[PDB]
Symmetry: C5
Subunit: 324 residues, 5 copies
């Protein structure tokens, strides 16, 4: 089978997240069955058998599937939209290398500082929404050591009077630097200057969207409803799926497997369907299937410095192609 | 468990909204059971037992889940779209600091008034759609005291002859002020003036969208259908889940728990699934998981005045970075 | 309860639309039961009792919920998209007041005629898609009396040779008038002229979208499938939910309530879920929860004439704000 | 009822598409029942009765509704998106009448040829994706007779060396003609020339989208799964819903109606729910509820020639309106 | 029937993908039944019969349909969005033929190199996400032999210091080449140069989106949950649908067909519904219903070289049309 080979995986798998909840389920199933074997008196085992036939009546797999399928679809839709809001600088680096001009050191100062300002504004929003980025940069000093912010840029950064998140501050620095480069003629076209500000606002909106998703999550009332629905089912199966003794002649309880194999396969299904939504509710951590942000941060700074510095005005000479 | 720790929460939780409906359910369950204990005569308890076996037949959890899952998905989709229509001024503040120019007091008059005009137009739409903003500004005088509107701006505001909502009026003031700043050369580029009007219309459309969502809600006919579906179920369980006495030998009514634990866990599920849609149907109030508008209003005025006044034309000198 | 107070409403409610279908259901239920009381012979009442146990077998609430939940979600998605295509002129009125110039009467002629051309093009599309707008303007003469079209504009309107809907004609008049105002220098910026034509095409596309939704509705084959599914159920309950006499000892027919209360609550649920889709299939009529178009038409003409005439170049003098 | 009047329709109705499948179902039901009446021996009628109680066990209406509701929602979403990709020229005709200039014959040559180039490119894509357009233009000669392509335009059209669909060729002709009209000063603004190329690419993308939908349909594997699911059900009802004789005393088979009325109403429901997806899988044919393309083709050529020729620079003189 | 003719297909059909899983199901069904015929002892056949009545209780088709319908809808939505991210150059080829100018060889060098740079950047992203493109170009030398990259362009391509995917490198070459053509006057309009960079970033974002979908797939935890749900069902039917002998008198096991025809039709339904998601999870391979990328790569290079070279400035002379 195609998807059949995938269930033998462990890296970010279903068994890596649920293996613990199973033995807390199966262990409680055996501890509640071994009482019915040994220590439970004969009159109260008769009471237990009526309690098992009560709980299996109210154990309905149908409604839980509805609250899982509509809750999960909502979570995976929000999770994919958070990835599209990732601050990428490849669109800004094409406008900068075509609109900013100069082979001298001041031209290279402009192109590298503009691309560092976008990269700094992505570091600042990602250390606020990702714990994997936050342990790389615990303090703003860590951002000065990494090269994204200079100490001169740090003094005026820390002297702005704002109680709010200052990720927008290098975006304003970008607009002051591009207006200076348009004033000094480094930007030959006024329409080119308009394109730089158009593309920076597209970049700044993506940094703003990551703050929006991080602040307004899925409602807690709706996360709690799906969770008590899934665990009201597993308590309706911790009693209602108990193997009663066949000497009592209860109908559809005629074997003593001492292993709820089909109940455990429902637990893999139901608690694993819930586990999809628990891993995508906060996709910016250090888990193995979280968004690889630290590797992404290195890229939008390595490929943007590569593009506006060595690849500025460095073209091969115009050859006639093979199909001329 | 991951989501298991969340059910011990109270702040905007499921128990904070449903705790009252439970004791009006469980109290009516006990008052209807204690009649069957004591005061109900023996011939009419036989009538009661046939009424209980009638109501549990017509109590189907399936169809209610359909009208809840499709109604809730529609409400949470509309609720997230209302948050994206929030009037934010961070895109306008980057165009203003790069297109408007001047270190003198008239340049600072332009940049602060343009950003205050957008902020005033967001105050005006949010006091019409949010009760939390409306108690902060009960009157337009409250908007003059807060600094968003001057008394001179108030005279011509109140002398416009319009029976409709005047939130669009500072947006028209923006377009008159930007056309004046383009006439006096404060805006060096005509394409830059086009960018200001492009971004203001993006801002004005978001203020217009919050009015659209506030006027056209989810249809009342559809809210009433989901509500009578959920409460036709709980009356099919206020009778059909009554513990009849086991001396009558009725099938699948063989215990007298005197506590509808599984019926109460369905009430947590069903009435709590409905409670998701009741809190997101009007997300602009003073509840604890509503949109924090008052804190947002302070931000788009603190970070816009910070950006166009102190951060205008104030850049660190161009240093070679660590990876030069 | 939150949604519990709403079921006591009548204005555009569920009872306002279904109250008639109930007595045609409950009246046919009683007329079919009173035959079983009185006029039906004893041998053919035995035939009736086997017919009731046949129809309640094939009465499944599940599949109908599927064809209602997926049909309704599709209708409410199309209904909300029709409201976003409403021709609003607030975006055009900000570009006109900033790009068109002149304090003389010819400047005011330009600004009022351009905004009237957009408003006329919205009147023309809304009288073709809304019956509430069509009774306000039954003829094009009614549009000349209301001020949206002049008699001079009427002569060339009626002399164009086109068998198709002429709502696009004031949009072409807009582009001829703006090109004339750019030729005479009333529009100082060529980029400003580009912004006027960009925003008019956004306006003209919304008028074009209202024609698209009005022409291509939900497929009739799919409306008929959901309707015969809902009424195959109610005929499976007009027989299968009949109270047979308990002297015959038929199982799960042991009471004679003479009032299908739970069947009537399913009718409120099912026929009311269908009624959501019947009211949003054509949201432009005179019903109480239809789109208030006549009030909207008055607004986009009152607030556009207010904005380009009295508010043109009329700003308060630049005061230092409270937080200078 | 509102939707109740619609089931008496025939034009593109449910009965117009399913009436044939019913008599092939009901005829096979009677031919399989009349064997059980007459020709089937007494020992093998006992075998037939065990086969009927086998097939009605495995006839589940629930799962089929899931594969129909999720398959149909996907088809109607793709069907509505194909209609929005229809090549309409009303946006191009407003830019052409405002940007292209001249009252002489060369100005009218420009405006009519540019609008014919867009209309030709829509004819070429629609004869490749619509069978109703293909029978109107079986050959490119049919396009020369209709006026969309000249014979001079045909020579270079047929001499391009390309094995692929050449619908993009009049879009390239548009860009060469607009660049010529900008070179000769017919286009006064360079920003106006940018607007023409911006709007043509919006037009060319819609022609490209109709090719994309026509090439990548719904997957055949998924169409086959929904089809074998619906017809595995009707064979589980061609046996499992047979009226066995009541002399054998089989439970819940106690009548001999000789007319599967409730089975036929399920066939109207299920096979009709499938028929929604069969008609919207290819919406460009000659069926009565297909997209009226031939009438649309006549419109975008009649209203575009009307708009750029008679309505070019032909405005009523500027009158003061009624509310001056 | 309409969809009835499609089940006789083999090319990319349901039987082409599932025919193997059926005989591994039906073969295991017969091998487990022939034990019950012959080799299983009489006391342990009694144990087998209680095991069959245990497994058919826990075989529920309902919940599996929920995890298939919501998983498949998510996969087909992501699959159609990957096709819209395909790097097509038809929008860039219309801007290049209208903005780049010159009938000499340097003008043709510009137009062909700019269109080859976009086509090279599409080859580079498609050999990273498609195995069908990767076997056409196993090495970058294969890209030099095909004409997309010159050897001179290869030297500086391979000498850039980057550990990441270099598909963005011809997009940066485009922006350097267009800025050179604007400097030398080949691009007459500065707004035209802005349009080239606007359209290249639209192209570069589509190449970036194909990398995003290829890196972030559907979560493996959710693929594993749907797979163990579908195969927990088929093991609940490999036991629970076994034909027990009718001499034991077990209820609803009264025939010995020795062919699980209805169980095999559920396998066609369920395992085939899963097979839809296995083929669209990676749509870029060599299977018959995968995206035809190699044919698409040939087109965007054949029709772009055709459009900017032979069709540059080559128009028919302006004739009066048939409806002048
Ligand atoms: Cl522009």
């Amino acid at each position: 089978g195609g998807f059949s080979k995938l269930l033998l995986l462990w890296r970010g798998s279903i068994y890596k997240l649920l293996w613990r909840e199973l033995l807390c389920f199966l262990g409680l199933f055996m501890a509640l069955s071994a009482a019915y074997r040994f220590v439970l008196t004969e009159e109260q085992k008769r009471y237990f058998e009526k309690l098992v036939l009560y709980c299996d009546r109210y154990a309905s797999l149908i409604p839980v599937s509805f609250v899982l399928g509509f809750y999960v679809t909502l979570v995976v839709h929000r999770w994919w939209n958070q990835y599209l809001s990732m601050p990428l600088t490849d669109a800004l680096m094409c406008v900068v290398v075509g609109t900013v001009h100069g082979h001298d050191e001041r031209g290279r100062l402009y192109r590298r500082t503009l691309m560092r300002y976008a990269g700094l504004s992505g570091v600042l929003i990602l250390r606020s929404v990702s714990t994997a980025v936050f342990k790389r940069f615990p303090t703003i000093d860590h951002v000065v050591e990494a090269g994204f912010m200079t100490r001169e840029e740090r003094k005026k950064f820390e002297n702005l009077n704002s109680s709010y998140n200052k990720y927008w501050v290098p975006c304003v620095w970008f607009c002051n630097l591009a207006a200076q480069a348009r004033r000094e003629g480094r930007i030959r076209d006024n329409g080119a200057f308009k394109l730089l500000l158009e593309e920076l606002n597209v970049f700044r909106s993506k940094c703003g969207m990551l703050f929006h998703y991080d602040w307004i999550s899925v409602p807690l009332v709706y996360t709690q409803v799906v969770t008590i629905a899934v665990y009201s089912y597993f308590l309706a199966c911790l009693i209602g799926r108990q193997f009663l003794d066949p000497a009592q002649g209860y109908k559809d309880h005629d074997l003593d497997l001492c292993v709820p194999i089909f109940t455990l396969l429902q637990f893999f299904f139901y608690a694993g369907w819930l586990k999809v939504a628990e891993q995508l509710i906060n996709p910016f951590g250090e888990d193995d299937d979280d968004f690889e942000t630290n590797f992404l941060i290195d890229r939008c700074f390595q490929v943007s410095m590569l593009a506006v510095d060595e690849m500025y005005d460095d073209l091969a000479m115009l050859e006639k192609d093979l199909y001329w």
